[PDB]
């Protein structure tokens, strides 16, 4: 109970090579091959991975627009006051409308 490999199902199968092969022959990988040497390697992943660095499109079939904001560190220009990330809902229900309105000011002042 077996079957032979295909030889015609698509152009890569007709050519009996993926385009990835001829591209790897044209350029083996990124410049990182010059580094992470260690006399031997189990896999090339501790190196240039015999390729180029992946992106999310190679993992999920979608697209993403260019970024329009930055997050170089999460603890600069922060709220630095009790706001939406940490104000407790039972305490907020107990807490008078006077500060509920002033606290909506503090939420608007977020970054």
């Amino acid at each position: 109970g077996h079957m032979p490999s295909p030889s015609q199902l698509d152009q890569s199968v007709l050519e009996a090579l993926p385009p990835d092969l001829r591209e790897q022959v044209e350029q083996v990988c990124a410049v990182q091959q010059a580094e992470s040497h260690g006399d031997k390697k189990k896999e090339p992943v501790n190196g240039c991975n015999t390729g180029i660095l992946p992106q999310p499109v190679g993992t999920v079939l979608l697209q993403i627009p260019e970024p329009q904001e930055s997050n170089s560190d999460a603890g600069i220009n922060l709220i630095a006051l009790p706001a939406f990330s940490q104000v407790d809902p039972e305490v907020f229900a107990a807490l008078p409308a006077e500060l509920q309105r002033e606290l909506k000011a503090a939420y608007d002042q977020r970054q």
Binding site: A94, E98, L99
Partner: protein, 76 residues
């Protein structure tokens, strides 16, 4: 005596006081525990904000009693 000061973040910061403790000095003890300047804290009890010049006794706050602490909700 001690009182409980529930912060906006749901954390009870218990502190030791007298009924005659002024709100300014209570805010100063909050600064000692939470690190918020007293000029930049707001304090509520039973659905009203307090003022600095008053005391726990002015509000009939006694021992083992609960307050709210909020930052002033002003940048400085």
């Amino acid at each position: 005596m001690q009182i409980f000061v529930k912060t906006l973040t749901g954390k009870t910061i218990t502190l030791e006081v007298e009924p005659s403790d002024t709100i300014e000095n209570v805010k100063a003890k909050i600064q000692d525990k939470e690190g918020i300047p007293p000029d930049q804290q707001r304090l509520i009890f039973a659905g009203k904000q307090l003022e600095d010049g008053r005391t726990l006794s002015d509000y009939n706050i006694q021992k083992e009693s609960t307050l709210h602490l909020v930052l002033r909700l002003r940048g400085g």
